[PDB]
Amino acid sequence: SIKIRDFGLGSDLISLTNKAGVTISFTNLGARIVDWQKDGKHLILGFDSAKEYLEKDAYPGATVGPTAGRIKDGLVKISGKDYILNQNEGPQTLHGGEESIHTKLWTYEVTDLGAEVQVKFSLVSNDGTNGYPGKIEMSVTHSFDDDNKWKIHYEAISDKDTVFNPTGNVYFNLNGDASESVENHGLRLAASRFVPLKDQTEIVRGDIVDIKNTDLDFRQEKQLSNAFNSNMEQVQLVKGIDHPFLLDQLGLDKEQARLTLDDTSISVFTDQPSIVIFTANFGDLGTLYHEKKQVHHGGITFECQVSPGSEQIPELGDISLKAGEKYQATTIYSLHTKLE
Amino acid sequence: SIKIRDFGLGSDLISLTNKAGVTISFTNLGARIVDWQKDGKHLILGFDSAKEYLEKDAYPGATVGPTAGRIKDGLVKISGKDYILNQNEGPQTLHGGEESIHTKLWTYEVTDLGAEVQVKFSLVSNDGTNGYPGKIEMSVTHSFDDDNKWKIHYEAISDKDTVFNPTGNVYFNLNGDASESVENHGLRLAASRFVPLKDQTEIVRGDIVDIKNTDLDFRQEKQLSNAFNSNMEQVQLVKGIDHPFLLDQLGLDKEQARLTLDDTSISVFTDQPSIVIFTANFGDLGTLYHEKKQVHHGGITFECQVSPGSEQIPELGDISLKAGEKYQATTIYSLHTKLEHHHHHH
Numbered sequence: 001s002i003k004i005r006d007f008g009l010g011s012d013l014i015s016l017t018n019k020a021g022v023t024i025s026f027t028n029l030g031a032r033i034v035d036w037q038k039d040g041k042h043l044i045l046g047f048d049s050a051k052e053y054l055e056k057d058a059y060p061g062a063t064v065g066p067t068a069g070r071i072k073d074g075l076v077k078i079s080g081k082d083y084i085l086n087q088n089e090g091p092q093t094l095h096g097g098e099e100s101i102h103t104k105l106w107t108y109e110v111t112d113l114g115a116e117v118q119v120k121f122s123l124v125s126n127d128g129t130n131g132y133p134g135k136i137e138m139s140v141t142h143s144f145d146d147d148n149k150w151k152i153h154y155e156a157i158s159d160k161d162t163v164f165n166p167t168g169n170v171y172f173n174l175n176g177d178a179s180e181s182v183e184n185h186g187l188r189l190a191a192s193r194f195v196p197l198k199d200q201t202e203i204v205r206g207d208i209v210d211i212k213n214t215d216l217d218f219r220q221e222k223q224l225s226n227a228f229n230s231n232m233e234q235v236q237l238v239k240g241i242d243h244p245f246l247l248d249q250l251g252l253d254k255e256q257a258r259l260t261l262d263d264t265s266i267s268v269f270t271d272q273p274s275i276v277i278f279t280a281n282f283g284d285l286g287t288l289y290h291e292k293k294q295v296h297h298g299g300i301t302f303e304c305q306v307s308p309g310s311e312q313i314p315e316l317g318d319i320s321l322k323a324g325e326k327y328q329a330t331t332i333y334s335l336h337t338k339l340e
Numbered sequence: 341s342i343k344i345r346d347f348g349l350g351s352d353l354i355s356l357t358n359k360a361g362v363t364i365s366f367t368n369l370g371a372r373i374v375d376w377q378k379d380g381k382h383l384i385l386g387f388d389s390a391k392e393y394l395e396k397d398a399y400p401g402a403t404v405g406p407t408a409g410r411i412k413d414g415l416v417k418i419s420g421k422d423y424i425l426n427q428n429e430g431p432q433t434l435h436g437g438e439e440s441i442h443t444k445l446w447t448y449e450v451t452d453l454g455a456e457v458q459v460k461f462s463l464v465s466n467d468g469t470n471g472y473p474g475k476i477e478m479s480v481t482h483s484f485d486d487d488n489k490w491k492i493h494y495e496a497i498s499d500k501d502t503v504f505n506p507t508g509n510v511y512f513n514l515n516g517d518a519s520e521s522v523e524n525h526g527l528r529l530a531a532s533r534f535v536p537l538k539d540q541t542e543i544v545r546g547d548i549v550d551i552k553n554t555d556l557d558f559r560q561e562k563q564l565s566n567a568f569n570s571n572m573e574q575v576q577l578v579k580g581i582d583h584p585f586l587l588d589q590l591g592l593d594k595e596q597a598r599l600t601l602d603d604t605s606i607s608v609f610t611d612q613p614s615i616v617i618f619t620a621n622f623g624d625l626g627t628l629y630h631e632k633k634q635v636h637h638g639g640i641t642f643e644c645q646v647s648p649g650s651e652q653i654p655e656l657g658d659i660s661l662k663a664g665e666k667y668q669a670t671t672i673y674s675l676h677t678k679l680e681h682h683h684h685h686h
């Protein structure tokens with residue numbers, strides 16, 4: 001079933017319930033996932049109205065871009081030319097600059113295919129918006145099916161050569177409560193390398209580091225507490241994890257990561273080369289979710305995209321988007337429940 | 341009473357009914373007026389769903405900007421610097437460029453004051469959007485009261501020196517049917533001068549011309565047919581009217597224009613210096629409004645703003661907006677019945 005209701009400020013809340021009784025809900029404010037629940041429990045972090053997102057934290061569950069992550073000095077080179085993007089975190093451009101796409105009301109259309117339902121969100125980024133050449137016509141399709149698969153498919157076309165590398169910013173928390181650390185979750189991740197950060201500004205350090213046999217090796221399932229209790233300088237630096245991990249094998253068919261808590265597990269699939277993992281290292285901030293004060297480590301992201309830092313480490317990839325080329329990306333979050 | 345429902349594509353329709361039974365409705369798609377009815381008759385032009393606007397004509401009833409009208413070659417000078425804006429009509433920048441504010445979903449909040457209900461729409465134009473320096477935090481408040489006054493109040497603040505001169509693109513048609521020409525309407529307008537256009541590209545000619553005693557003189561009420569039938573060069577150029585009229589006396593207290601049909605009149609008040617009048621000179625295009633094919637001259641606008649062309653004719657005004665300075669503008673359309681005797685036949 002599908003239900004649409006007012007979510008505040010003119011935004012809509014679109015709720016999808018599949019054959020299994022699982023409910024997922026989105027908002028056009030930022031083409032974003034708001035909730036995901038099973039047997040009354042929330043699997044992800046989210047607020048109860050549009051206003052909360054705007055007042056508390058506008059990132060959770062949102063489509064972020066045009067470029068996801070931090071860009072050093074807000075500088076990108078396009079067709080050999082330097083362009084300075086909006087700077088919203090010191091001199092860096094984080095998640096596309098201030099008042100970006102995650103804060104706009106996108107238009108949308110719902111398509112019911114029975115076993116699957118799709119919600120197609122659309123937005124036009126005008127040429128020059130926040131320094132980005134365009135216009136960029138963007139669409140994000142969130143779908144949900146009877147096999148409990150939540151899929152995100154991105155598409156874009158630009159009138160001019162530009163840069164494009166968005167991501168989905170959902171935070172998972174299988175405890176179903178923000179006041180509870182994810183340290184008890186088990187994580188598996190098919191990546192042998194990571195991208196260290198230079199310092200507290202969080203720009204990339206410049207190198208690619210092998211993590212095999214370190215507190216960050218999750219090639220083999222492991223509990224989060226291990227990473228959290230590690231003394232690696234990179235962990236210590238951010239007080240948790242806040243880094244890009246480089247996937248060993250690319251392809252949408254491979255399960256790239258798996259998050260588990262008891263009989264409940266989330267599998268991640270993507271066609272992207274990296275996953276940025278951030279463990280809600282907010283200290284005592286205590287943002288409130290459903291009346292519960294969030295704790296440090298009270299959430300974890302799986303941001304699938306081209307790794308941030310390619311401006312300094314070209315090996316990571318290239319986020320350019322040439323005029324007239326069609327950009328496509330797909331990320332899938334699959335939910336499973338262990339039957340005894 | 342206030343009612344709200346989905347209008348399509350994620351937009352909503354906000355319908356207000358005042359104590360007199362008059363109803364007016366808006367959409368957050370372009371902070372736009374959708375309809376205004378009296379006794380079941382549409383006073384303006386509008387569509388039945390959001391998709392129609394996007395597919396047929398996105399301007400009607402919308403809030404347009406950041407700069408309303410045509411800017412020659414898209415070139416503006418801001419604080420001694422030349423900036424080129426998005427050009428969407430040949431080398432011209434028309435109504436803020438392509439995919440502008442009239443095409444966006446604005447957020448909104450409704451405030452019920454009892455005798456007056458306000459609908460405040462908000463949007464942020466990011467710095468650099470379509471060439472405009474920013475960011476620009478904008479808000480448009482549309483309100484309707486028990487006195488049948490529909491008021492539009494604009495507000496804006498920029499982080500950077502920029503240009504700002506938006507307007508509201510409503511089209512009236514007191515016949516209540518798009519397929520009926522407004523040549524049968526009576527028009528009174530307190531303006532002695534106008535701004536002629538250079539040619540078919542519609543950029544300004546460079547001069548201001550006195551129109552007293554011409555077919556464009558509406559200081560004393562006359563039927564619109566007088567203008568439509570004129571062979572004055574400017575009328576022929578655009579096949580009707582599509583010009584800025586310079587108001588003789590400024591001030592929100594003065595009735596600047598009055599449009600009448602039989603027992604119904606719409607009065608126009610504004611704090612702006614000119615009114616751009618466009619009479620839907622679409623020829624045989626025939627866009628469908630409520631299943632009626634719109635006729636040439638099937639509608640008329642009263643876009644109150646600073647006149648377009650100030651880039652070339654400095655005397656028209658200055659639309660610059662300094663960083664941190666608060667912009668404000670107010671325009672009011674009021675509805676009356678039996679204001680005067682208007683009994684004609686076409």
Ligand SMILES: OC[C@H]1O[C@H](O)[C@H](O)[C@@H](O)[C@@H]1O
Nearest residue numbers: 059169202242276278301303
């Ligand atoms: O999740 C939103 C963002 O929050 C923080 O800024 C993290 O440093 C960043 O890596 C993450 O993507």
Ligand SMILES: OC[C@H]1O[C@H](O)[C@H](O)[C@@H](O)[C@@H]1O
Nearest residue numbers: 399509542582616618641643
């Ligand atoms: O109605 C919106 C606009 O339509 C046409 O482009 C007219 O030339 C212009 O003056 C008018 O304001």
Ligand code: NA
Nearest residue numbers: 010011012352
């Ligand atoms: Na809505």
